[PDB]
Amino acid sequence: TVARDITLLECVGKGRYGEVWRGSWQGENVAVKIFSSRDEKSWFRETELYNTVMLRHENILGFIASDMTSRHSSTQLWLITHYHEMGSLYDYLQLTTLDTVSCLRIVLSIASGLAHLHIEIFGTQGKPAIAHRDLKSKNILVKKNGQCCIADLGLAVMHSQSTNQLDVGNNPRVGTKRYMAPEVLDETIQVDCFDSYKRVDIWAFGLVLWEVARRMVSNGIVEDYKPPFYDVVPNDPSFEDMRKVVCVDQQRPNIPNRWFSDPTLTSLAKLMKECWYQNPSARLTALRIKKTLTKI
Template sequence: MERLGVSVLRCVLLLFSTSLFTGLHASPISQTPFVLRKLCKFCDVGPSECNTTQGHCMVNCNITSICERSDEVCASAWRRDGENITVETVCHDPSEPFHGVTLKDFNNRECVMKQYAHLGPDFYICSCQEEECNEKLIFSSEETPRKNPPMLTIVLVPVSVLAVILLSLIYFCYVHTLRQSKLKHDFSDTHSILTTKHERSDSVSNWLNHNTELLPVHLDEVVGKGRFAEVHRARLGQKTSENGVFQTVAVKIFPLEEFVSWNTEREIFLDAELCHENIVHFLAAEKHTVEQRLWLITAYHARGNLRDYLRAHQLDWTELCKMGGDVVRGVAHLHSDRNAVGGVKVPVAHRDLKSDNVLVKDDRSCCICDFGLSIRLHNNMSTEELANRGQVGTARYMAPELLESRLNLENIESFKQADVYSMALVLWEITSRCTVIGELREYEPPFGKLNQPCIESMKDTVIRDRERPEILHGWRTHPGVNVLCEMIEECWDEDPEARLTASCVSERFNNFSGPSFLYTDSIDEDKTSNLPETEVELLHLSS
């Protein structure tokens, strides 16, 4: 007990001296906290129906931008010229004039309009500091802005929080000392945290790392980079299961300024009903505040993404059915409002489906990854909420209605059908590398003649010229590929409502493994007499 008291006292003195030394000798870098840049509505001057007589109104701006600098604030300018009303929303440095006016009231949580008569009889400007606060413009004097707390509060609150943290650390040292003699230095505790009541027999369940200690992950090489993050191959310090499935993991690392993308993907993964063999397996989400990084930890698949795999490999018919079926089943599971056992599930639209976002496992099965742009399709979502999701995705794989920004926001199924179009392009990629279609060309993505196309060039190709990836005549000679091509064409139809659903395509894929799809130029009725009716029907269709 005397040794225990000495240990606790030593811990308290160490914490106190460290805090004192840090306060007296902190470097300029440590004194300057990392500040996230703001999210503001950011649209050029455009027509608006927002009127001062309404008291307040919402701007019709669908673009949300991360400000370039942390000291910038959200600002809006409202102007009426006769019967025409225009609104401008921007990120702006308050130290610089905005329309010739120095912003003095930017320390607000709401955007309260102030009239500037010298700019015109009906010219109003507002500024504020909350996320996207310049979306709602307040004209009524009854709706006064909520000022940020006074300086005394700003000082007292952090001091109080630090005091609580210090007491918590003292308590932690005490508890840690008590337990030190009882705990063994192994991975059993970490495993017990990762394994919950939802655990499958063959994998570790989805889990958000709420523990104060981060998982013992050692980063290895970078294996991929995207718009928002980079992916590392990594190793857990010790095995997380008896067979060591997740000893090697993938860590997707976001900078703090990409919090929105990290949080979107994290929230998608946190739905336990998302778990599926054709969805990449999620392990943990962590905040690394010291390094100012955000982590998502998932299963690692050494074969990489589907696009790179197809570039280096040819497929036979069985592999085509397996890989294509896996992609379809993954999309169908995302879109479904039921899980595999009939439980309620929130549908998810991926919104960036492409071969780069499909991983190939060791057994050559596939799983879908990268949910940074995904959306959970709740039935009670309003048109405004859906509209604010904006025009996202990769231009090469975007459906016609997305390219033209004419998605039907009255129906959440529209988001799913846009995914189906993208899925059709991925199926075309897989089919183009199958040996049963005849002589194979070098791999190329859909619309391969276009190099890194933008939205405008894709609009010209897909909408104006009504082009789709080429399906050669030789593909039709194989009965199975012929039926698959017909499905692909139905999935990339110009009309979203005419496209097949992912669940329908999944059901049809289940018929692709039978003997009716052996290569043949004619149908022998004697050979088909013992086949299931669905396979005979498909065989006749393909011939």
Template sequence: MCNEKIYYSPEIIHTTSNPLTPKPELFNTLLYSLVPIMGIAAILLFSFWMYHHHKLAYPPVLVPTQDPGLTPPSPLLGQKPLQLLEIKARGRFGCVWKAQLLNEHVAVKIFPIQNKQSWQNEYEMYSLSGMKHENILNFIGAEKRGNGMDIELWLITAYHEKGSLTDYLKANVVSWNELCHIAQTFARGLAYMHEDIPGLKDGHKPVVAHRDIKSKNILLKNNLTACIADFGLALKFEAGKSAGDTHGQVGTRRYMAPEVLEGAINFQRDSFLRIDMYAAGLVLWELASRCTAADGPVDEYALPFEEEVGQHPSLEDMQEVVVHKKLRPTLREYWQKHAGLATLCETIEECWDHEAEARLSAGCVEERIITMQRQTNLIAPDDILTVVTMVTNLDYPPKESSL
């Protein structure tokens, strides 16, 4: 046995000392080392090519190369000096300043960089073909200010001293003719937004759903003409194109339609328009509650459902009141004794109907208001004095801070 072991030992040494065997092992080692390195290099080269290709694809719209999502300064502004004067409002997306641009006052809505998506969406909506309209807030331009972490996104629009419909109704009552003028111009602006208009001079105007209709987003010009503002949540509907982020539960809770509160939205164009119409009914109710036309007291200004849920309702609060109990703001009995207000109450109820398909269109609301004003003024002109008891205060605390 000992001799046997000694006999086989040289064979083992002879086999393992064969100079040809290390070559495939070395080749395999090199192969396994180089393949991952080459793979990583290929990925880096492809990523660089994609980045470079993407940058070159959109040079006219995206100014700073370090942030391809931002829009360049508007050519309407150029290098004109813009001086911020005072803050007029604050909200969830930013704040609004009164500012000086040459010899006129303008409004500057300032978004922090975290709210870039809202700023970008609003800029795009204002820039759509056909969005210049008397009853839509006049857009002047958009700018990026600052650098690095201090970047601010500015949206410059016309400035209206009277502020929002909320602000105005807090401090003022309205006559019948004033109510009709505000309601009609608001409905006209909403009807125009909701309309698809081909063949305009500057292109095809798509249907636009606002998705945050409320009295805070309706501004009043000096003659009380209404114009709709704040398109940060708006959607446009163009044939053959996606409407974008159609997430259902957006907007201001107290103005949310039942189907929004339930999370049961049909994500079709008409569904979003009907959601706007529900909120429009609440805005018309706010106007009616501050009108002096009826033979009865004028209530202190209150937000819709403030009596039921207070000033800061939760989503659950609104679901309980609007969806489960199917409540709506109170329509006073003595409003029904005024022919015009009675028609307006009927219109309001058809706007905030629980069934979305039963709601009126904005165009229909506009026509109704024109008709009821004409008929009422034939019966009782607005210059006839009506004695009204006002239940109101001179100074009101702010009720909501959303822009």
């Protein structure tokens, strides 16, 4: 199997989930995620999705192999993907500003990726409908051509129309608190309905729009990279922190004055605002966001 053939070179990321490494396979960089024991369900889910569904798409992180292996005399669960050397959107936004073309490229490729996940495709070629549930700038990678791809199907949920069956998996993992929709933070989300999970994705994608737009230059100026809600919650905010700010105080990220004098940024501000209605039913769909971005 593929695990045995990889040389781990350096660690590019670490958290409670485990670790991601640059390794070489067949003379190429690959990304290897090594799961912690506390997160083996996310390995199982990603492996399930990539193996049982046809998931090749320019804007979805490309799967190579999933593997079990031994190291230091214990079992490690590995997920091997294409390696993107520009790193995550999160890192990238910190190291560079964007022009209009670069910004729209980033946001259109996210929306294309997400539309693709959300939409059930029929036949011998296709795929069930899929919601992500942990969309954020750290789970989006930047490719050399300026497009992005969506990463981490660990929390993914599926629906298929023949049977109308919802598969929510079996993962105790929760999404990133910073990016939880209101109906998640207030725990009134209807867990038996596929559409609810789509709407949590849209809420999160709104925030990512906001994060990107800040780094687009207009009138020679930019805002510094910041995470959503930077001004009102601490680092590593609690569930209650976010509940107070999003649900109780009803806060939403501020739109800089200067966006309103640029058309690309004005379109983006309206889009992201309609990802952020408290009432989930009111939010734009991925396909609507994609189509609009294709107009600009």
